[PDB]
Curated annotation (Swiss-Prot):
Modified residues (Phosphoserine): 67
Entry comment on modification after translation: Phosphorylated on a serine residue.
Origin species: Thermotoga maritima (strain ATCC 43589 / DSM 3109 / JCM 10099 / NBRC 100826 / MSB8)
Protein name: Putative anti-sigma factor antagonist TM_1081
Keyword vocabulary terms for this entry: Phosphoprotein
Entry-linked PROSITE patterns: STAS
Keyword Zinc: no
All copies of domain STAS, residue ranges: 13-122
Similarity comment text for this entry: Belongs to the anti-sigma-factor antagonist family.
One Pfam family matching this protein: STAS
InterPro entries named in the record: Anti-sigma_ant, STAS_dom, STAS_dom_sf
């Protein structure tokens, strides 16, 4: 709870998909500051409030991220972890894995090779 909800209707085209009860948030080349505070605000009302307790982040289509949204990624985990859910990542390319140690990303949020290794195992991890 906090800050005023003021967001007119001007969404572009969200890069993600939905799975059986799971949500695959597949960013490409747009994780700039203007899609970072709002990123959580979209996820909260597209998925989290909607009932979704399992998000995944594929990093295949993205070489890296800025320090700004790098902390929003954790924040989305913190919210889920408090709500009853889990969130994990997929195809963590070696360029992110190098920063994902150094910023405690993997050391907080789960990591898998594929979606499938996650999708049945975040169920039990």
């Amino acid at each position: 709870m906090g800050s005023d909800k003021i967001h007119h209707h001007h969404h572009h085209m969200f890069p993600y998909k939905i799975v059986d009860d799971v949500v695959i948030l597949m960013p490409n080349k747009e994780l700039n500051i203007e899609n970072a505070h709002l990123f959580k605000k979209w996820v909260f009302d597209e998925f989290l409030n909607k009932g979704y307790n399992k998000i995944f982040l594929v990093l295949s289509d993205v070489e890296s991220i800025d320090s700004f949204s790098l902390g929003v990624i954790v924040n989305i985990l913190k919210s889920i972890s408090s709500s009853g859910g889990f969130f994990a990542l997929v195809s963590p390319n070696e360029k992110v894995e190098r920063v994902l140690s150094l910023t405690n990303l993997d050391r907080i949020v789960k990591i898998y090779d594929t979606i499938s290794e996650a999708m049945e195992e975040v169920r039990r991890k």
